[model samples]
Target: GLMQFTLPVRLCKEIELFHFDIGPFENMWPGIFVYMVHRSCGTSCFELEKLCRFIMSVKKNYRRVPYHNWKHAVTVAHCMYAILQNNHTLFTDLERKGLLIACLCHDLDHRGFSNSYLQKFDHPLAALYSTSTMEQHHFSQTVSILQLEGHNIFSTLSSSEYEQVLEIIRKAIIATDLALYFGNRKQLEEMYQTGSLNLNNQSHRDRVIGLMMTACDLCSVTKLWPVTKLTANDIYAEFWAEGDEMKKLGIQPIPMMDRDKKDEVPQGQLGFYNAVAIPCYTTLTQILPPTEPLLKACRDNLSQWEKVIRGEE
Candidate 1:
């Protein structure tokens, strides 16, 4: 049945083209960097292959059928790559590798819904990872499979090299937690203000990595027109579906958006964008100009939503 369903071939092609041009994998260093880290961290070629297969098998998971799916993942990755390319001299080999790997693997096994849904059903992931990073569990799950004695990818690596790789993976994976975005930004700004961005120290990579990843995640507003429109529709549909679930539970759906009440969908979406997304993107744009296109797209999408609210779309 999964195979019977149609995939977003056009979207995938568009994103693939984007990545081929500007993605981390475009360079030999990036791929080599990822492979080196994976090997050192005990991740095997088999495991990496499996991860890729899993990602492909779950093509439905990438369409942004609601929101927070493959499209979003690719979009964020693209944004991060763009930012890094524009600001290349600021990062070291390890930092660049870590950022690229993080962006690609951040939402490896998303379930096409928000954490609220998982928490509501008392999903195993929710119970096991209370107040911890959700994506981290997914990352760990991927890595754990490789830890089996024979399956261990890092079996050949020295202890120190293994630890170094593990540290990079952990820090980068955990940084994707949305809750930490604002705080991370503030820390980066503070570090910049203090002139502590020692170009010589590799540890300073964390600040750059954190800011760049977070910025990409929030870069939706700065997308090109068609891409922006497509992503917005996906987001709205997801929000409405989430609202439906809340209504079934006898809970008040998020303010302003309840699909059951069609009239409210657009207004609710507008409120969310104005209150949350716009401010976030505005702040992000100050650090990266390419983000402006996405932001403009967001504003346009908001206008479209307003038209829908007015029964014009």
Candidate 2:
């Protein structure tokens, strides 16, 4: 039943329809995003379409779950949209679209837990992709989906365009590395200080796009109160489940979420919010006010989680 379960059929269809609503790929936001990147790097519609199809295909392959599912895709898309609106002065139409598309496709085939879990459990994906480059593997998997005969989105693109698309996608996906969060944030701050909208430069654009997408991925922490609480509970539940499974296998359980023992769940949740989420969103809202409400939601969510962890709920 788990494997058979999938995102709602209607949700999947909606993603597909949304991809093309851009008027022959002219004005659509995602289309525009791809166009901007392609303009700089020289990609074609084929490559762009291929990227889109790859995202959908991966979603089809995975079960719809609390953490990694169609809902995540929609969340990424929504956050990217908000980012575009907030930082309009810094991006061209194409750049905006590219960022959204990148966000939508970033976690295409993600397993629920962190990359560390994949390595620890000897997941086939981890074994095959053992090089200190899990992100690379994810990127390649996305590209592979498009290479299938009928699904090749790059078939129509010229070699140059293909290469460009590959570069953009690679950079965006690699940005999902949580380890690089602080470094990426620093780069964004430097760019913002310069006040130069230099998206014509691929490196500059890539850096900015990468950070924006990462921010959106974590945006749920700052969502509306109800939405934030629901998401937090789901994440905590998933983390606890994985921690329990790890314990059964005689592996050290991931801390905080291990419901098997009465531990520091509340403290851990608070530390995560105060140490990571707050600083991140606070900085983000300085440039994107739309995030303020979400940050407030996150605060409330943290309180609820604290109560639950303390057995007060």
Candidate 3:
């Protein structure tokens, strides 16, 4: 809810968005980000503009990497925004706002490295939480940003609502750690398979949030085949670099990370689709039929990958 003394919503605060990328983000973010926040959450323009500024600030904090950059953040955020719009009745206003903001800040300050990379090298972040390392760091980064002057987007909410929103945001952001997805998906599968899940249950609802975050995290794979290949290649480029770093440190990298196996990259996509995407979306669409497109796209992309595996494409 808006603060008791909050400024009135201005119907005249309209602006146009050209392209969200290719140009400087500053010119286009305020309009599109604020407008989407307002449209999805019923937040006032005055408040959302500051939120948009905070989001761009977060985007700039990202390191220059082949992947996991500001652009990926925007893509995931936009995907989550689109999902909420497509399934409007499934989420509360707080969940919608929290999920979108979480998407934007989920990879905050990523250094193009994985949690395993951090742990292997005894990085400071690895010692902090002992679980969900980067995810916790991302959530902590979000809290730090929220505490900045003029950046707390949930400022208009009552104290309890503000805390509720923040907690939801934290959960949604950490849920992006794919390590969390296996357990979440299995639990949801059991519920759906046994016919014991109740949508009204808070546990079930949080699981829904968890699944949504994972889907948005892998939104690229659920995209058109051409786009999926481009995104997948960029991610591999980053992984390959991470492997180079590990090599310099005398550490053995995983096959996916090894530049030597770079030629085998296409061979891995089928397993990703089979093990991760198909199961997650199959469970999700069972609860929300609109999510069927993601499953279809994943299978379509898998077929494309199969062609490359067999030297047919």
Q: By TM-score, who's the top model here?
A: 3
Per-prediction tally of clashes: 9, 6, 0
Please give, for residues 1-313, the per-residue lDDT of candidate 1 as tens digits. Answer: 0111122455335432222222233223323333333432224322454444443433333343556665555556566665655564655555554455556556666655566766776778887777543766756754654453444534545688667656666777676676776676666556666766554566556655655566566565555545555666677677777777777777787653466565555566677678656655564455555546545666776777677777887
Candidate 2 stretches greater than 4 Å from native: 1-56, 92-94, 127-134, 153-157, 187-202, 261-263, 286-313
Whole-model lDDT, candidate 1?
Answer: 0.56
* Pairs of residues at least 3 apart in sequence or in different chains that clash in candidate 2: 22-28, 33-97, 33-98, 42-161, 46-153, 222-294
Local distance difference test scores for all models: 0.56, 0.60, 0.78
Alpha carbon deviation, residue 117, candidate 3 (Å): 0.5
- Weakest 10 consecutive residues of candidate 3 by summed lDDT: 14-23
Better of 1 and 2 by lDDT: 2
Write down the RMSD of all candidates, one decimal each: 8.0, 8.5, 5.2
Measured against the true structure, the TM-scores of the candidates, in listed sequence, are 0.65, 0.69, 0.89
- Residue 219 C-alpha lDDT in model 2: 68
Ranking by TM-score: 3, 2, 1
lDDT of 2 at 212: 62
Better of 1 and 3 by lDDT: 3
**What is the lDDT for 217 in model 1?**
68
lDDT tens digits, residue span 249-296, model 3: 899998999989878788777788889988987887898787777788
